Amino acid sequence: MSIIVISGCATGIGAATRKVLEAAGHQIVGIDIRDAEVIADLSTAEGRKQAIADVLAKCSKGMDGLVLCAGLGPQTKVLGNVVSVNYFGATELMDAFLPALKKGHQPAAVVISSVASAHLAFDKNPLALALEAGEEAKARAIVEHAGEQGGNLAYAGSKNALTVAVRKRAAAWGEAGVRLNTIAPGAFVPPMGRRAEPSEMASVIAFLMSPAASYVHGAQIVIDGGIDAVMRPTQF
Amino acid sequence: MSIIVISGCATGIGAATRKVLEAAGHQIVGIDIRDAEVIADLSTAEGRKQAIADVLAKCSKGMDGLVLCAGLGPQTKVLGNVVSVNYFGATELMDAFLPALKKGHQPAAVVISSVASAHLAFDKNPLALALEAGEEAKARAIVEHAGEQGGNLAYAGSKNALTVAVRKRAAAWGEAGVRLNTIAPGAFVPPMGRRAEPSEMASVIAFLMSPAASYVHGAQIVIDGGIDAVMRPTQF
Numbered sequence A, B: 001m002s003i004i005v006i007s008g009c010a011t012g013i014g015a016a017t018r019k020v021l022e023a024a025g026h027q028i029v030g031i032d033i034r035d036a037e038v039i040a041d042l043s044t045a046e047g048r049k050q051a052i053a054d055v056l057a058k059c060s061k062g063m064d065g066l067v068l069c070a071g072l073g074p075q076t077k078v079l080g081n082v083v084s085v086n087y088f089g090a091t092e093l094m095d096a097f098l099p100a101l102k103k104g105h106q107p108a109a110v111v112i113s114s115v116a117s118a119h120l121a122f123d124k125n126p127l128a129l130a131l132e133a134g135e136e137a138k139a140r141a142i143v144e145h146a147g148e149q150g151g152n153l154a155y156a157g158s159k160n161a162l163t164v165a166v167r168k169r170a171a172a173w174g175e176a177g178v179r180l181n182t183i184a185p186g187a188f189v190p191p192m193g194r195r196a197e198p199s200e201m202a203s204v205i206a207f208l209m210s211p212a213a214s215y216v217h218g219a220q221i222v223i224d225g226g227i228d229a230v231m232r233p234t235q236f
Helices: A012-022 A045-058 A079-103 A128-132 A136-144 A151-167 A170-175 A198-208 A227-231 B012-023 B045-056 B079-102 B128-133 B136-144 B150-168 B170-175 B199-208 B227-231
Strands: A003-007 A027-032 A065-068 A108-112 A179-185 A220-223 B003-007 B027-032 B065-068 B108-112 B179-185 B220-223
Touching: A003 A012, A003 A079, A012 A027, A012 A065, A012 A198, A027 A045, A045 A079, A065 A079, A079 A108, A079 A128, A079 A136, A079 A151, A108 A198, A128 A136, A128 A151, A136 A151, A151 A179, A151 A220, A151 B227, A170 A179, A170 B227, A179 A198, A198 A220, A227 B150, A227 B170, B003 B012, B003 B079, B012 B027, B012 B065, B012 B199, B027 B045, B045 B079, B065 B079, B079 B108, B079 B128, B079 B136, B079 B150, B108 B199, B128 B136, B128 B150, B136 B150, B150 B170, B150 B179, B150 B220, B170 B179, B179 B199, B199 B220
Parallel strands: A003 A027, A003 A065, A065 A108, A108 A179, A179 A220, B003 B027, B003 B065, B065 B108, B108 B179, B179 B220
Antiparallel strands: none
16 A cells, blocks of 8 residues: 555665565565566666556556665666666656655655765766756767766766756655655775665665655765765765 | 763753653753753853763763754854854763763764754854864854854854864764764655654654664764755755
8 A cells, every 4th residue: 555666676775675665564666677566677768668657557546655776886888878777767767756656645755876976066067967958868978988987977977967856856846745865875994894784775765765754855865884974074 | 771861952852852762762861951960051161071071970881872952043142152052062072972982882973963054164164263173262252253144153153163073073983883973954744845843853863873874974964854955956
């Protein structure tokens, strides 16, 4: 009776989030290339469109939540997919699911960005304009024609653009009565002295999807053991 | 058994937090001008020194947590007190209590800053250097001689410096095994367009003080119903 849609549910944080939310009594409709109710490859427009239709077909009466965990990191073989999945795989889905979310009970959504979103300024983001304008081919070309790196550009650039996109939707989602927040997993040795377990990302998402976070909206919760605080003490 | 020290426990968020953590089974050692185990006024150096001594005497075996909710808003008659309580009332206590927290079980601390902490850049904060240097008289003089909007300066200035102070302690606190984060209040039912109840701040603090936030350290969690996102979409 309480459906929550989760992209990237097959592995990592997405898988760990499915576990915690199911323990809370939610019915999950997952989206991924495998081990998911909705099989889809979010790297292309056609793939996302079909995914959206497949999900909405199962949520004609609405959904209570949405968690977008699909994502590709640097080193990804084809860099164009990093931009497509990380940005459009999130933005097109959250935008298409808002109507359904609006009908839900205490509706909320969480988007997995990255601390890398703070490694660049949006106005200095080579992908910013293209991504905001919905120019996917252009954005993919940029990273595929990137200099030495390219991977960090596609990753940091897409995540930075993603966080800003979520914050720019705060007003509209607030009017619709749906909370929308992001978490930013870390990406040397953190002050807390260890690497995180996906479960530690999922527990924060569970908090953000619950009434305990009733007044939390449009925020980005950094989960990195303290690295960001050490690197950017004066920036928040 | 499990002691949690809470400053500003008599009213508002401090009171709401005390209720939630007490329900969680914690023994609370409150610090406030009234209705507290430790009666103290944190506006003076001697007052804080005495409060620290009185608290440590009750936590000889350590403490499991610390929540600093003491604070004064703009428009407080004597602006010097805003700086003293908001900054030193927090920094001297957390620094003095670290040894005790270090001895605790899954120790964590939460400091209540404000969304106002982001309304001024640390490098452009007229109180920054004085506060960091521990020059209380100098800092108080700055706001009491500011004239127009000296109240906003005292408030935004102390809170900005506070959030930076907490972030610069991330490395040391992490090495000590104690998590340290801030919440940034702004001012069921959708949050946008309404004020929050103190309980909605306390529920986030409860989360930050629990294992669910095991990898959250040095972070500032904004709890404002989305206002900050609307105002600063590209800053986070």
